[PDB]
Design a binder for this molecule. Structure first.
Ligand code: SRM
Ligand code: SF4
Ligand SMILES: [Cl-]
Ligand SMILES: [Cl-]
Ligand SMILES: [Cl-]
Ligand SMILES: [K+]
Length: 538
């Protein structure tokens, strides 16, 4: 690799980071949008105030403003559902470690309630909240309301650092390695500039995902993150070994690889900054399918990339990985649904199943009420789109289990529901090839009516090759496609994936059978469960 390849391609100009003139040739259309107007100005210079006043029909009449609502607003966590819910915006938060409060939950519920049939909310595969139904004129007030309850939506989509994932049992599990909350909190504060915006990390070549591991279970899925912090002692000191480059895409899925780097615990933010600066400064900005950080690592080689991280560390020091980490390979992933004792004597947490992560305003208020009456006003989200309510005095559990809402959001649903994960799909997402959430519930219910089983089989449904619901991690994965019935009629279908493993012995699943009509999936899945997962016909 030539020395010229290592010239930083972006520069700071008036508080923002822009592509240098000499590197602007051959860039993709999204890069052109960022050059034409800095997206962060919508927040940091309050550009949103005037934009929100313009009728959407008028906005659509000029490239600049249409790009504002369709592209730049994703820097403020706002996603125009142009195709499937025109004029409405999904809104996505920062929620490090999946931690929310009852007050925040009630606020979000009050927003979606206003929108009636156009509103609802979802737990995401990054243990995050999304709300739906937002209209542009309401955005300035919603931004204010979020701030008032201690939430930000900054930098949650597009070419930004995505939600920092941690251990859903952080601080409460007798078996945790290290509480991940301080680290994911620090990362979120760094990324968002303490909720003011951080332009230094908002002009990346592409999205970038971090997680901090604190569980032997590896609930955080470090193998599929762009940066994963693996807890490790080195020379008598606590810190993290670093894995880099994990990602999924339509074109390519790759597991994270060792950077061959260890940092002391206090260097979590400095090394996040160094890695992001290297990616920002040096990443390819052509074909969008070749812009994720792993592509830079392949171009430079991992050692070449490591040197770029090292030069961006304070005092330019980056230690080599510790030979061993603290994650025990002898481990069985633990079910977190149901009632479990905390490490604080006399307290329990309860894991509640949220069917395909979907909630309405009334449901959110109920969950917030439970967290206040039984817990400490805290609700935790999980990457399987479920919830945990921690800090419940164990003597209250008997009463809690009789709460009517637990018949819908159950601490002990059937085993296949426990592991079911589904993306948004075509109800709202314009990329979706099929409907996911309703279909996956229907099929799973029918399958479980036919077979019983004891193995915790994890089924993931995703609506298109973007694989937001991570079909490559599933025991059985379903990727949306269009296919044909026996008469040659167009029908919704799924490509069925097998072979995904999580935890320390992780593995990426691959397509097993293409183009199965959705109406034909039940018998296929029933047979797979009996033949490969020990299920027994009822
Ligand atoms: C909500 C969520 C799925 C869910 O139901 O839980 C989701 C939903 C969307 N994803 Fe995703 N992604 C979600 C996690 C993922 C993950 C899983 C993960 O992070 O562990 C992946 C695969 C892992 C990865 O990217 O490395 C993922 C891969 C993508 C991709 C393909 C990325 C690529 O490099 O090609 C796109 C399209 C893109 O970015 O170009 C995408 C784009 C989208 C958009 C924003 C597309 C759009 O504007 O319509 C989807 C919004 C639909 C909607 O209205 O909800 N989404 N997306 C997840 C939100 C996470 C969060 O809170 O931040
Ligand atoms: S996998 Fe496809 S259909 Fe599902 S939310 Fe992501 S982009 Fe939309
Ligand atoms: Cl996006
Ligand atoms: Cl769309
Ligand atoms: Cl996404
Ligand atoms: K769920």
């Amino acid at each position: 690799v030539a020395a010229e390849r290592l010239e930083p391609r972006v520069e700071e100009k008036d508080g923002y980071w822009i592509l240098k003139e000499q590197f602007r040739k051959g860039i993709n259309p999204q890069e052109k949008v960022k050059i034409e107007k800095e997206p962060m100005k919508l927040f940091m210079e309050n550009g949103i105030e005037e934009l929100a006043k313009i009728p959407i029909e008028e906005i659509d009449q000029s490239k600049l403003t249409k790009d504002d609502i369709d592209v730049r607003l994703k820097w403020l966590g706002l996603f125009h559902r142009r195709k499937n819910q025109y004029g409405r915006f999904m809104m996505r938060l920062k929620l490090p470690n999946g931690v929310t409060t009852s007050a925040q939950t009630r606020y979000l519920a009050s927003v979606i309630r206003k929108y009636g049939k156009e509103g609802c909310a979802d737990i995401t595969t990054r243990q995050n909240w999304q709300i739906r139904g937002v209209v542009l004129p309401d955005v300035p007030e919603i931004l204010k309301g979020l701030a008032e309850v201690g939430l930000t939506s900054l930098q949650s989509g597009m070419d930004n650092v995505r939600n920092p994932v941690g251990n859903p049992l952080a601080g409460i599990d007798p078996e945790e390695i290290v509480d991940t909350r301080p680290y994911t909190n620090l990362l979120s504060q760094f990324i968002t500039g303490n909720s003011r915006g951080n332009p230094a990390v908002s002009n990346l070549p592409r999205k970038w995902k971090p997680c901090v591991v604190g569980s032997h279970d590896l609930y955080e899925h470090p193998h599929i993150n762009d940066l994963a912090y693996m807890p490790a002692t080195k020379d008598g000191r606590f810190g993290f070994n670093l894995l880099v480059g994990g990602f999924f895409s339509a074109k390519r899925c790759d597991e994270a690889i060792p950077l061959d780097a260890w940092v002391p615990a206090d260097d979590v933010v400095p090394v996040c900054r160094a890695i992001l600066e290297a990616f920002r400064d040096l990443g390819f900005r052509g074909n969008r399918q070749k812009c994720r950080m792993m592509w830079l690592i392949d171009e430079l080689g991992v050692e070449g990339f490591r040197a770029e991280v090292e030069k961006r560390m304070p005092q330019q020091q980056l230690e080599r990985a510790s030979p061993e980490d603290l994650v025990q390979k002898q481990w069985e992933r633990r079910d977190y649904l149901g009632v479990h004792p905390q490490k604080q004597e006399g307290y329990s947490f309860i894991g509640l199943h949220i069917p395909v992560g979907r909630v309405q305003a009334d449901d959110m208020d109920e969950l917030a009420r439970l967290a206040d009456e039984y817990g400490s006003g805290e609700i935790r989200l999980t990457v399987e789109q479920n919830i945990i309510i921690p800090n419940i005095e164990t003597s209250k559990i008997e009463a809690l289990l009789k709460e009517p809402v637990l018949s819908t959001f159950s601490p002990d649903p059937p085993i296949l529901m426990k592991g079911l994960v589904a993306c948004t799909g075509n109800q709202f997402c314009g990329q979706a090839i099929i409907e996911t959430k309703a279909r996956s519930l229907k099929i799973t219910e029918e399958v479980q009516r036919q077979v019983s089983l004891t193995k915790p089989v994890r089924m993931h449904w995703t609506g298109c090759p973007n694989t937001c619901a991570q079909v490559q991690v599933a025991d059985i994965g379903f990727m949306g496609c269009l296919t044909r019935d026996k008469n040659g009629k167009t029908v919704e279908g799924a490509d069925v994936f097998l072979g995904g493993r999580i935890g320390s012995d992780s593995h990426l699943g691959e397509v097993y059978k293409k183009a199965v009509p959705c109406d034909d999936l039940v018998p296929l899945v029933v047979d797979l469960l009996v033949n490969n997962f020990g299920a027994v016909p009822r």
